[PDB]
Structure formats: structure tokens, C-alpha cells
């Protein structure tokens with residue numbers, strides 16, 4: 135019940151007690167592990183006050199005021215507001231703590247060593263999609279910081295009755311369009327084909343190129359969503375070239391510098407923030423392995439191997455593997471040259487081992503999802519591969535939520 | 545109740561009902577997942593239900609459930625258990641069991657081949673010398689001059705746990721590892737502890753970098769005994785690279801036959817504690833893990849040096865570059881010497897076809913994503929995008945403690 139995790143490369147063993155504070159469910163039972171399922175599955179007055187109590191108790195513990203007058207006063211004050219209003223509002227300081235700890239608790243995130251440096255933008259006074267646009271532009275500019283990227287989150291008003299939801303319909307703030315063609319192939323980003331539809335199909339005018347930055351589709355107070363173009367001077371992009379292959383630039387590849395997830399739900403103290411775009415900086419493999427080389431994405435392996443004149447006849451020449459490394463060398467090379475923050479998978483996983491060490495030492499544990507923490511290339515030459523991890527669900531947390539166009543009473 | 549898995553690269557969705565036949569625990573609970581944990585004495589009381597469960601499965605597979613053959617065999621096993629406290633499997637049952645143990649092995653990517661297992665019944669063996677003879681014949685049959693054939697040899701089952709047969713080697717064929725006084729390691733670092741036992745038991749170590757370890761064999765709970773596998777039975781492959789001529793000068797070689805020998809085979813409640821089994825290698829087991837793991841031969845540095853790579857910052861991906869070349873060399877050397885090997889792209893594609901077939905004709909296929917996904921180039925293989933359900937079916941292969949920790953020495 136006071137569990138242990140072993141690293142098999144170093145024999146270091148850690149003792150996890152934090153899992154005893156777990157609350158939500160994992161989807162596993164003692165008969166079947168769902169550790170590899172991508173995503174398994176209104177608040178009443180009754181369920182809401184225990185959730186607030188749990189949160190405020192850990193908040194006042196972290197500031198070393200558990201069982202103080204200020205604690206009990208805040209407890210009763212929120213208690214009163216719930217009995218009256220059927221919800222409540224977080225103090226700024228509780229909002230920042232809640233956001234930083236949703237990141238800290240995100241078991242699938244390898245970049246958490248930076249969790250405590252998050253920049254939190256309170257947008258709870260926003261009322262309109264134009265206002266949402268303004269807040270999001272300010273976020274993008276601050277986080278991008280001319281290439282010296284800084285982590286940030288912007289938090290729009292919390293859900294009330296589910297009829298007045300604030301939603302960013304983009305899955306990320308910055309993403310490239312994707313169009314089906316007569317040919318039957320797909321131009322641009324295939325993962326964005328449906329959304330690139332629902333933009334044009336909502337009023338957008340597509341340049342129909344390969345790397346067209348999608349417009350924002352912003353929904354305030356449950357109204358119809360509105361299109362907005364992010365000023366190009368705010369969207370930092372990196373042309374992609376190889377440090378050794380001059381034909382690489384002729385591939386005509388580029389990627390954007392800012393990864394900004396915008397479709398998740400932030401839960402703090404029982405309250406639900408359905409619009410909470412957050413951003414950090416890329417790990418190189420997200421672009422080079424996944425975005426470029428997934429079959430259901432840009433899928434450039436064949437063209438790159440062709441240009442390398444590799445023996446593509448049999449899989450045992452490891453030509454996909456060989457191209458894959460070169461592509462990822464280039465992505466890192468391009469970002470570093472243009473002075474835009476990026477981390478390689480060796481540094482990020484080494485950082486995460488250090489972070490686990492600190493969490494076990496000063497917190498008693500660190501929830502972690504091996505299936506997602508281990509990079510999608512060169513898995514076993516990174517230290518996380520040999521690291522046992524326990525996965526459990528803490529709160530505050532980021533959660534998945536249904537796509538809006540399926541839900542909006544249009 | 546039914547359960548769905550989705551392939552996120554092809555949107556193929558499958559429905560698992562087989563998990564309803566699940567017995568043993570996983571280690572997971574509703575509030576914690578132990579999915580990445582490497583490792584999560586039996587009386588007549590619980591034995592006949594385990595036997596009955598197994599025989600019901602056996603007779604369903606041969607389309608004879610409820611037959612008089614089925615009912616008499618149940619009765620016969622029943623009386624043998626109450627009279628003798630254990631029971632014996634028929635030959636047919638033992639073959640069925642070992643095949644299905646492999647079929648149920650949720651961490652094995654190679655399971656498309658499960659129906660083609662050669663089973664050697666060694667239940668009449670009684671001494672370590674008899675064990676040595678059976679294992680030699682397995683190695684000769686399985687190697688087949690490089691045209692490898694899957695096989696398993698099954699020594700007598702446990703009785704009171706004080707008369708166990710055990711193969712003390714973790715694998716039938718492995719290289720020695722020697723710790724030097726200066727702290728460095730010669731050979732395979734993973735085998736230092738076992739090599740020391742062998743030397744303590746009287747093995748004369750040649751102390752090279754690729755010395756095949758002796759077999760240490762324990763019969764009927766007696767002290768184990770040393771034997772040297774005849775070298776002409778140990779097929780080995782010099783590692784060269786198809787473009788780099790300097791690669792041969794690294795002096796690398798590997799044996800051809802992967803043969804796991806320290807696991808426990810469970811069939812109908814009977815425990816077979818010595819059950820060596822062998823197949824053929826996936827390239828990455830040698831090229832990624834054996835050679836490049838930091839706690840193994842760890843040749844990335846030497847290979848990166850000779851490739852003249854930017855080794856100053858990790859972001860040059862010099863490690864990933866050297867790893868790919870080492871894995872091309874392993875595949876090229878094996879193919880050139882006509883020793884059966886499979887690359888990780890071929891092996892994962894086959895397992896996806898196997899898994900889909902299993903869902904259709906069996907109702908599911910238990911699978912451990914953490915172990916199925918290869919240790920390099922994960923997401924460019926199709927298993928990476930495949931959701932999988934992990935649960936334990938029997939017959940099964942289980943882990944057991946190392947014998948030198950539990951053995952009572954005679955002298």
C-alpha cells in the first residue's frame with residue numbers, strides 16, 4: 135500500500151505514498167489493464183462542496199496554514215457561497231495554485247519539471263469572442279517572446295449550466311490546414327481535415343496551400359463561434375533544413391514554434407474551466423516523428439528516403455529508421471539556429487527523471503503514464519524506458535472534453 | 545459485457561469478449577495502474593477446479609465438450625487427485641497446454657507462430673545428466689543449421705516444491721560477464737552474478753568477451769551440476785556492417801538461438817518449473833538492448849566514435865544515429881549467414897494481423913503495449929497506434945524467483 139518503483143538501468147528504488155490521495159478512477163480493474171487506451175471515460179450543490187473542501191485543504195497546507203483562522207474562514211465563506219449561489223469563485227491565489235497543480239498532476243506530460251514557473255492569465259472577466267481573441271493574441275505574444283518561449287495558460291470563465299460554455303474550437307491555437315483533393319490524397323495536415331472543413335463550412339477562405347495557419351474559432355457564452363485570424367507577425371515559424379543535406383530545404387518544410395493546447399478542460403476545486411489554452415515549447419520528436427512521419431499525418435518518410443537514395447525495397451534495410459533520425463536532426467537544427475526554444479528527447483527525459491526524483495523526495499510521488507512518457511523513437515536509449523512508473527489520477531487536473539461541434543445547440 | 549479497442553492510425557475497431565475468461569489478477573486497481581511495473585506450494589484444495597477448467601477448455605477445442613471421453617477424463621483426474629494429490633497430463637493435453645501458454649503470453653510480439661511449436665516431453669528425465677542430454681537435443685533441433693524452429697522441452701512438474709527441476713541459466717545460451725578489480729566489466733554485464741556462481745561451482749572461465757556460459761542444471765531438487773554445451777551446437781554470427789568496413793574490427797558476434805529457460809509453465813494447476821523454450825530473434829533484441837543498453841555491452845560510444853559523429857551535445861542525435869547502424873549490421877549479418885531473424889517492422893505488422901485474427905476467431909488477444917512496442921522507432925510501427933487490453937489467461941508462462949535464492953544446499 136506504500137508502493138515502490140524501480141529503475142532497472144540504475145537499481146534506484148523510490149517509495150510512492152502520494153497515490154493514496156488519488157481520487158478519480160483509472161479505467162483499470164484487477165482483471166484487465168487499460169493502460170494503453172487513448173481516452174476512456176452538471177455539478178449539483180451536493181457534490182460541489184466536498185470538492186472545494188479537498189482543494190482548499192491542500193491549498194492551505196501548501197502555504198503552511200492548515201487549520202488556521204484564515205483556512206476555516208475561507209472554508210465557511212466558500213461553504214456559504216455554494217449554499218447560496220450553487221457555485222463559487224476562486225481567489226486569484228487559488229487560481230494560480232490550481233493551474234500550476236493541474237500541470238504538475240498531468241501524468242502524461244514529460245515537461246513537468248517546469249511546472250512551478252507557469253504564467254497564469256486570468257481571463258474570467260471576458261464576455262465575447264472578440265474579447266477572447268484579444269486575450270489569446272496577448273497569450274501568443276507573451277509565450278512566444280521572440281523565440282525565448284515561456285509557459286503560459288489563459289483561463290476563461292468557468293462553466294455555469296452547460297448552456298453558456300466558453301470554448302476554443304481549435305485543438306491547438308496554431309495548426310496547419312488540411313484539404314481533401316480530387317486525386318483522393320490529402321493536402322496539408324490530414325488530422326485537421328474535418329476542422330479545416332468546419333472553418334470554410336463556417337465562412338473561412340482557404341489559401342489551399344500546404345501550410346496554411348488555421349483561423350481561431352471562438353465561442354463565448356455558448357453563442358455561435360466566430361472566425362478570427364491570428365496576426366501573422368504573432369505566429370513564429372521555423373523553416374526546416376538539414377545541417378548536412380542541402381536538398382532538405384527544397385522539401386519546403388516548416389513548423390510553428392509554439393505548441394498551445396486549447397481543447398482541454400481544467401478542473402479545480404470542483405469548478406470546470408472549458409476554455410483554458412495552455413502552451414509551452416516543443417520536444418523535437420513531436421514534430422519530426424509524429425507530425426512529419428505518421429502515416430495519418432504528413433507522412434514524408436518515402437520522399438525523404440528517396441532523396442537519400444536508400445534501399446527502400448525491403449524493410450530490413452531500416453530505411454524508415456534512418457530517414458526518421460535525419461528528419462529529427464533537422465528539426466532540432468532548424469529551431470536552434472533560429473533561436474527558438476526546443477528540447478531533444480534525451481534532455482527532456484533526463485530532466486523528467488530528475489523531476490521524478492524531486493517529487494518522490496519532496497512530495498511522496500509523481501503520477502506518470504509510461505505509454506506517453508517514453509518518446510516515439512529511440513525509446514530504450516532514453517532513461518525513462520527503464521523507469522517503472524505508477525499512474526493515478528490527482529486533482530486539480532486537465533481532462534478531455536467532447537468536441538464542440540458535436541454538442542453545440544447551433 | 546463487451547469491450548472495444550481502436551487503432552488510431554486506421555480507425556479499425558475490435559470487440560473483446562475473451563477478457564471474460566480472465567482469472568489471475570493484473571496488479572492494477574480502479575485507482576492505480578501498474579502497467580509499467582516489470583514484475584507484479586499448492587494443495588488438493590484448489591487443484592481440481594483448475595484441472596476441470598483446463599480440461600473443459602481442452603475438450604472444447606477438440607469439439608468434444610460433454611462427451612464421454614470428456615466426462616471420463618474428468619472423473620479419472622478427480623480420483624487421481626484425491627488419491628495421489630496431483631495428476632498427470634496426457635501427451636495431447638501437454639502439447640495443447642504449452643501452445644496455449646505461448647498463445648496467452650501478452651508481452652510476446654511473435655505470437656503469430658504459436659500453433660507451430662515443437663514440444664519435447666522430458667517428463668521421464670531424472671538426473672542433471674539427463675537434463676543436459678535433452679537440452680542438447682533441443683538446441684540441435686531448434687537451430688537446424690540456421691533455419692530456426694520453435695521448440696520447448698518440458699521436465700517433470702513440481703510435487704512438494706522440494707524436488708524441483710530447474711535450469712539455473714536465464715537463457716540456454718548466454719555470454720559470461722566478469723567484474724574487474726578496477727570496476728569495469730568484461731563481457732555481458734547482465735551475467736556477472738550468474739558467471740560468479742558458475743565459477744564458484746568450478747567452471748574454468750576463459751575470461752574473454754564472448755564466452756558461452758555452461759549449463760547449470762538441477763534435477764529433482766538436488767544440487768545443480770555444470771555442463772558445457774558442445775560448441776559445434778552453438779551457432780554464432782559475426783557482426784559486420786554492409787557499408788562500414790571498420791565495423792567487423794569491433795570484434796562483435798552474437799548467438800543465433802534465443803532460448804528462455806528460467807520461466808514457469810502453468811497448465812491446469814500443474815507447475816512445470818523447468819521448461820526451456822526457443823524461437824528466433826527480432827533484430828532489436830540484439831541491436832538495441834544487448835549492444836546499446838547502458839547496462840549491457842554499451843557500444844554506442846565506440847560506434848559513434850568510429851562514425852565520427854558530433855558527440856558533444858545530445859541534440860545532434862548521435863546516439864539515435866549509431867543505434868540505427870548497429871541494428872542494420874545485426875540484420876545484415878544474420879541474413880547473410882542465413883540465420884533466421886525478423887526486423888521490427890515485419891514482426892509488428894504480423895502481430896497486428898495475428899491480433900485481428902484472434903479477435904475474430906477467439907474473441908480477443910491479450911496484449912502488453914509496454915512490451916509489444918519495439919525499443920526503437922516506436923511510432924513508425926503499427927502496434928504503437930494500436931489500443932490493447934492486457935489480462936491474464938491460463939495456461940501461462942510465469943516468472944519465478946532465481947533458484948540460488950531459494951535452494952537448500954545438500955553439499
Ligand code: HEM
Nearest residue numbers: 237240242243244245248285287412413414415416417532
Ligand atoms: C514546457 C515544455 C513542455 C513539454 C516539452 C511538454 C511535453 C509534452 C509531451 C511530449 C506530451 C505528450 C502528448 C503528445 O505526444 O501529444 C505532453 C502531454 C501533456 N502536457 Fe506537456 N509539455 C510542456 C508543457 C506543458 C504545459 C505548460 C502544460 C499545462 C500547463 C502541459 C500539460 C500537458 C498535458 C495535460 C498533457 C497530456 C494530455 C493527456 O492527458 O492526453 N504541458 N506534454
Ligand code: HEM
Nearest residue numbers: 646649651652653654657694695821822823824825826941
Ligand atoms: C518465434 C519467434 C519469437 C519472437 C520473434 C519473439 C519475440 C519476443 C519479444 C521481443 C519479447 C519481449 C521480451 C524482451 O524484449 O525481453 C517476447 C516475450 C515473450 N515471449 Fe516471445 N518471441 C518468439 C517466440 C516465442 C516462443 C516460442 C515462446 C514460448 C513458447 C515465447 C514466449 C514469450 C513469453 C512468455 C514472453 C514474455 C516475457 C516476459 O514476460 O518476460 N515467445 N517475445
Ligand SMILES: Cc1cc(N)nc(CCc2cc(F)cc(CC[C@H]3CCCN3)c2)c1
Nearest residue numbers: 245393394395398412413414415416417420
Ligand atoms: C503545452 C504543450 C507542450 C508540448 N511540448 N506539446 C504539447 C502538445 C501535446 C499535447 C498535450 C495535450 F494536453 C493534448 C494533446 C492532444 C491529445 C491527443 C489528440 C490528438 C493526438 N493526441 C497533445 C503541448
Ligand SMILES: Cc1cc(N)nc(CCc2cc(F)cc(CC[C@H]3CCCN3)c2)c1
Nearest residue numbers: 654802803804807821822823824825826829
Ligand atoms: C522465445 C524467445 C524469442 C525471442 N525472440 N526472444 C526471447 C527473449 C525474450 C525474453 C523472454 C522471456 F520470457 C524472458 C526474458 C527475460 C525477462 C526479463 C529479465 C530482465 C529483462 N528481461 C526475455 C525469447
Ligand SMILES: C[C@H](O)[C@H](O)[C@H]1CNc2nc(N)[nH]c(=O)c2N1
Nearest residue numbers: 519520521522580581582914915
Ligand atoms: C520499467 C519498464 O516496464 C521496463 O523497462 C520494460 C519496458 N518495456 C520492455 N519491453 C520489452 N520488450 N522488453 C523489456 O525488457 C522491457 N522493459
Ligand SMILES: C[C@H](O)[C@H](O)[C@H]1CNc2nc(N)[nH]c(=O)c2N1
Nearest residue numbers: 170171172505506928929930931
Ligand atoms: C493507442 C496508443 O495509446 C496511442 O498510440 C498512444 C500511445 N502513446 C502515445 N504517446 C504520446 N506521447 N502521444 C500519443 O499520442 C500517444 N498515442
Ligand SMILES: [Zn+2]
Nearest residue numbers: 162167572577
Ligand atoms: Zn492498468
